Amino acid sequence: MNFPNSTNLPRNPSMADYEARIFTFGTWIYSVNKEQLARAGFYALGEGDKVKCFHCGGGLTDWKPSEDPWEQHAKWYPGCKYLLEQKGQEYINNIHLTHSLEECLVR
Amino acid sequence: NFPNSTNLPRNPSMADYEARIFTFGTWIYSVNKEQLARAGFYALGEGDKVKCFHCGGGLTDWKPSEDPWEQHAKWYPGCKYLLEQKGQEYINNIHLTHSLEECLVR
Ligand SMILES: C[C@@H]1CN(CC(=O)N2CC(C)(C)c3nc(CO)c(Cc4ccc(F)cc4)cc32)[C@@H](CN2CCOC[C@H]2C)C[NH2+]1
Ligand SMILES: C[C@@H]1CN(CC(=O)N2CC(C)(C)c3nc(CO)c(Cc4ccc(F)cc4)cc32)[C@@H](CN2CCOC[C@H]2C)C[NH2+]1
Ligand code: NA
Ligand SMILES: [Zn+2]
Ligand SMILES: [Zn+2]
């Protein structure tokens, strides 16, 4: 099924280490930075710039220069327990507020 | 299109049980309209499409075995209404449950 892992157990424990995740990108000259994706929980799927969070399983693609790994992780997979552990709710809410503001302003 | 994870509801006009209830009208679908309302959902008037007033998360194609709260948690686990009403341990229960549901059947 599509649905995102909101348990405290990672969906892909084989990608639980940074170094495991880093290797998946290989050479990588997409708009957004591979080290920063890896720190944000992501590993490469091996097609385009598709990445998945090792924990929540959540997938993201089509990275723009202005799109931040942690920020996009929170936008789209807010139930992620890796996210919650690494950044912690005060960060997490401010970024939700930031997003939900933009969506309720120019849009 | 991304789900609202703030403590402020995306559709405050549907914040009241009363107001959500009125959206259904005569409801022919397999899931109970009051259970849906209590769980934050209101109807679009397009088949059994509903959305949470707070997170804005949409759900459709309701089978008889699908509970509003469980589905809310499955698909929109960041919803703060959900968090306020059920607690995180309820949410975890549901997710622990669905993951393990997946795993036994294969
Ligand atoms: C960095 C940003 C991310 N944006 C969102 C995005 O990437 N999302 C949102 C959503 C979570 C709904 C989503 N779900 C899927 C399906 O699982 C996939 C595809 C996938 C990704 C990685 C994989 F390993 C395998 C499959 C992408 C995606 C991008 C904008 N989105 C691009 C896709 O279409 C929608 C549009 C809003 C811009 N860049
Ligand atoms: C009660 C259950 C719910 N299931 C999941 C479901 O309904 N989801 C999951 C997901 C969150 C990805 C999703 N995103 C959209 C797009 O917004 C919509 C469509 C929508 C709903 C209400 C609206 F106001 C407007 C649009 C449905 C939907 C149902 C199974 N899903 C049905 C849709 O296709 C996928 C399949 C897994 C079974 N019933
Ligand atoms: Na109706
Ligand atoms: Zn994640
Ligand atoms: Zn909600």
From Swiss-Prot, chain A:
<comment type="similarity">
    <text>Belongs to the IAP family.</text>
</comment>
<feature type="binding site">
    <location>
        <position position="53"/>
    </location>
    <ligand>
        <name>Zn(2+)</name>
    </ligand>
</feature>
<comment type="function">
    <text>Multi-functional protein which regulates not only caspases and apoptosis, but also modulates inflammatory signaling and immunity, copper homeostasis, mitogenic kinase signaling, cell proliferation, as well as cell invasion and metastasis. Acts as a direct caspase inhibitor. Directly bind to the active site pocket of CASP3 and CASP7 and obstructs substrate entry. Inactivates CASP9 by keeping it in a monomeric, inactive state.</text>
</comment>
<comment type="subunit">
    <text>Monomer, and homodimer. Part of a complex composed of SEPTIN4 isoform ARTS, XIAP and BCL2, within the complex interacts with SEPTIN4 isoform ARTS and BCL2, SEPTIN4 isoform ARTS acts as a scaffold protein and stabilizes the complex. Interacts (via BIR3 domain) with DIABLO/SMAC; the interaction inhibits apoptotic suppressor activity. Interacts with HTRA2/PRSS25; the interaction inhibits apoptotic suppressor activity. Interacts with TAB1/MAP3K7IP1 and AIFM1. Interaction with DIABLO/SMAC hinders binding of TAB1/MAP3K7IP1 and AIFM1. Interacts with TCF25 and COMMD1.</text>
</comment>
<feature type="binding site">
    <location>
        <position position="80"/>
    </location>
    <ligand>
        <name>Zn(2+)</name>
    </ligand>
</feature>
<feature type="binding site">
    <location>
        <position position="73"/>
    </location>
    <ligand>
        <name>Zn(2+)</name>
    </ligand>
</feature>
<feature type="cross-link" description="Glycyl lysine isopeptide (Lys-Gly) (interchain with G-Cter in ubiquitin)">
    <location>
        <position position="81"/>
    </location>
</feature>
<protein>
    <recommendedName>
        <fullName>E3 ubiquitin-protein ligase XIAP</fullName>
    </recommendedName>
</protein>
<feature type="cross-link" description="Glycyl lysine isopeptide (Lys-Gly) (interchain with G-Cter in ubiquitin)">
    <location>
        <position position="75"/>
    </location>
</feature>
<feature type="binding site">
    <location>
        <position position="56"/>
    </location>
    <ligand>
        <name>Zn(2+)</name>
    </ligand>
</feature>
<feature type="repeat" description="BIR 3">
    <location>
        <begin position="18"/>
        <end position="83"/>
    </location>
</feature>
<feature type="region of interest" description="Required for interaction with SEPTIN4 isoform ARTS">
    <location>
        <begin position="15"/>
        <end position="30"/>
    </location>
</feature>
<feature type="region of interest" description="Required for interaction with DIABLO">
    <location>
        <begin position="82"/>
        <end position="103"/>
    </location>
</feature>
